[PDB]
Amino acid sequence: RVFPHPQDCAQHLMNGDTLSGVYPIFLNGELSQKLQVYCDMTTDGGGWIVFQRRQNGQTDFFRKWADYRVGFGNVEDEFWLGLDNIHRITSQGRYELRVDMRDGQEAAFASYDRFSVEDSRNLYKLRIGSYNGTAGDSLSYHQGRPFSTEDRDNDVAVTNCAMSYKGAWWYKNCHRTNLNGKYGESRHSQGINWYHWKGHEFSIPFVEMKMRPYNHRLM
Template identity: 55%
Template sequence: MKKEELRRDKPEVMTPKKSSQDTKAEESAGKITSKSPKLKDEPRTNVTQITTKKVNNTTKSVIETSKTKAEQSTMKEKPTTQQGQKEKASDDKQAGDGKELLNGALHSGEVDIYPQGREGPAVRVYCDMETNGGGWTVFQRRMNGKTDFYRTWNEYSTGFGNISEEFWLGNRLLHNLTSVGPVSLRVDMRSGNDTAFAHYANFSVGSEEKHYTLTLSGYSGNAGDSMRYHNGRPFSARDKNPDPLGIHCSRSYMGGWWYKNCYKTNLNGLYGINSNNQGIVWIDWKGKDSSIPFTEMKFRPSTFSPATHG
């Protein structure tokens, strides 16, 4: 009840005539007085003031109660939405590839994935969402020579470098991410204004117990099929050579790779070196004496269909 309406209660004490509004005010005041024994002995003016206070408090209480109920109703709805988002995020991140994480995104970028599920540690990866429809998880990049690729077995196992520039994602993670389902490989290269690519419809990396053995097939592209020479080969690093032929190609050509007496491509060789066959080489494209300035190796599910952007 409004304050100015309650003030009309005062004339009711001095005149027997009562309006319907005065009657309602008295009834309201009487109800409050009956609930509060102390109000019985106080003057009418005090009752009116207290009534005003009580009515206001009652009104406020009603508003607060309604708000609380509305908030509770909203809170009841939120868990369903959050649960759905959490489940979707969990599914996406557990998938562990750029396609699942950024499908529909306009730009490439860095994201966290959870190869071991939501309870496992996060791994930061770079997803290429622009090349040939996107969905690629990049696992190798050479671009400026800032990162040393002549590394140990353990370093190649765990990964190294800066994923925004030059890096190797890590053979253990490569094995985990390429063994969950059919995966395809793409290699992009650039030298000056010349570009080339190689695509392999099937690609996987074996476990550490199997020396991260390379498996690939189904070539297409314009770079030439240099990687086929390395199919079925174990990985070698400067301090470990599982090659039964006994030739330590990693030490000779200063990189970690799937060497085979020794290579037709060596994308982890020395940056900018155009002599002694120690550079970054794809023989079927630029020969063995031309070190390629930019390379990027990436994979995505073989069943991937290009995302619709915009």
């Protein structure tokens, strides 16, 4: 294998592991930093680490800071990979973000050619680059904002955005995207929203958030 200890899903792909599924990656290629991840090996040539999935509402996403810090759920079903993990992975180099969404047979996506999450001291602030896609650019609203949960309010609203809109996110006052919100909830802004695609009174039944090194475009 070209990469004995792959540090992302794109290095698995280069090894010949081109089937989507669960794989181990090793942060900075060091064996002691093993992390289990789900690799999407088919979207736009493959090589994406999936760090969030919603698909049936059987998993509770209305959790607290400590839960969103460490991660929760099953990587083959609905899950959140963990903010500490996302920070550590996006610090390995320049990553891109892709959000894929589906409503039955209709599909859309949004991509951002830079993606990072800051460390805990900086409250996991979101940094994104330039948009391409079909879903509309609803995530740039959230540029530079810290992460908030129902028990840790870091938004700039008088209200508690995470409590009012049943989620956990980089809230401002409050959101145009709410992908950790309440599954199937059509009430205004409380559900899984991507505003520019379906508005605030439609909850998206399938969504995946995923990341890949920018330099995979060269290969």
